[PDB]
């Protein structure tokens, strides 16, 4: 399991949709569902 800032440095150069899947599979990153978040609208 690599370090969080190492993930970032990797993506900055090579970020693509395939990498995101790989990082997700290895469990390096964890997708947050919308159900775990809230929205706020204002004017």
């Amino acid at each position: 399991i690599p370090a969080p800032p190492a993930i970032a440095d990797l993506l900055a150069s090579v970020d693509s949709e395939e990498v995101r899947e790989y990082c997700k599979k290895k469990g390096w990153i964890v997708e947050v569902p919308v159900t775990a978040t809230t929205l706020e609208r204002n004017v």
Binding site: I1, V30, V32, V34, T38
Partner: protein
């Protein structure tokens, strides 16, 4: 007082692949009305370490910033709200948890009188 780490930010060329990926899976897509502001509250995961974000729009730019809310409540500025061209490219970034709290991702259409904005976004956390 805590030393807040500087945020990292970058872009990637594939907007179309990205958006079409956002459509099929979560169908999470925001419509930011004329002169509106949409704030996405993202509470820090207890097992969490870092926050990672991605956002894009269809036909137009939109203001984007990141604020952190501690847990009347204290607020810290991570990414100053500014207009990015995310209709051309996918805009992404990352930041380290200063502590337990709630991230505020702001999509700011305030300047736009006549134009609503479609927003495709995604967020991850690490350990």
């Amino acid at each position: 007082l805590p030393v807040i780490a500087a945020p990292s930010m970058w872009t990637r060329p594939q907007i179309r692949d990205f958006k079409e990926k956002i459509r099929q899976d979560s169908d999470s897509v925001i419509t930011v009305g004329r002169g509106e502001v949409v704030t996405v509250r993202v509470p820090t995961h207890e097992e969490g370490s870092y926050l990672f974000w991605e956002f894009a729009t269809d036909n137009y730019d939109i203001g984007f910033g990141v604020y952190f809310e501690w847990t009347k409540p204290v607020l810290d500025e991570i990414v100053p709200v500014y207009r990015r061209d995310c209709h051309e490219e996918v805009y992404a970034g990352s930041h380290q948890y200063p502590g337990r709290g709630v991230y505020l991702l702001k999509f700011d259409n305030s300047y736009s009188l006549w134009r609503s904005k479609s927003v495709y976004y995604r967020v991850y956390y690490t350990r």
